[PDB]
Design a binder for this molecule. Sequence first.
Ligand SMILES: [Zn+2]
Ligand SMILES: [Zn+2]
Ligand SMILES: [Zn+2]
Ligand SMILES: [Zn+2]
Length: 200
Amino acid sequence: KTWELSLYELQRTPQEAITDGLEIVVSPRSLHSELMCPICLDMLKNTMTTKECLHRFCADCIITALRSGNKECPTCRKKLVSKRSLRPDPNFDALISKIYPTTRIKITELNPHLMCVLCGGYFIDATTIIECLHSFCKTCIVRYLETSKYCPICDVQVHKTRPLLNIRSDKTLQDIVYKLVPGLFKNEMKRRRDFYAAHP
Ligand SMILES: [Zn+2]
Ligand SMILES: [Zn+2]
Ligand SMILES: [Zn+2]
Ligand SMILES: [Zn+2]
């Protein structure tokens, strides 16, 4: 895939964090499409992630379907490499252990799981390194990988030559951010509209 950054993506401004503690509500019916396992229909327990498509399942659930199936992804029906294609998602389990309830949550407890260490703000076009499952903004990690072939956090090697081969868009994670953070999807889409209304 061409990781070309648009005119907006080159001059993109971070989405600043909301330090002033706001409490957001989380219903069990909402946030259901991203936190439930599409095999057991329960919330993810010991989350596993596919390197080819970034789809999350339970550790016991995905292992069951692979030993008795076509070694495909149960969601997108893409071909696996049968083994060493599944890496556990530890930072995803931490996010699950924060939001399993039906009460309201302080955003300051959720910010570590929704912020990019490269821009210092919320995730916009969340991209994930499929080797260590560390997520950043699309503009941040692509801008970053022009100079380094290693992860900004755990410092593992992304790829031997072309680091863009081992990154992938994390649509499931980005959908959690736009739903948790109020008005983020509205502000981010207006930022793009204001830019293209002044640079036609
Ligand atoms: Zn499951
Ligand atoms: Zn998949
Ligand atoms: Zn960023
Ligand atoms: Zn990493």
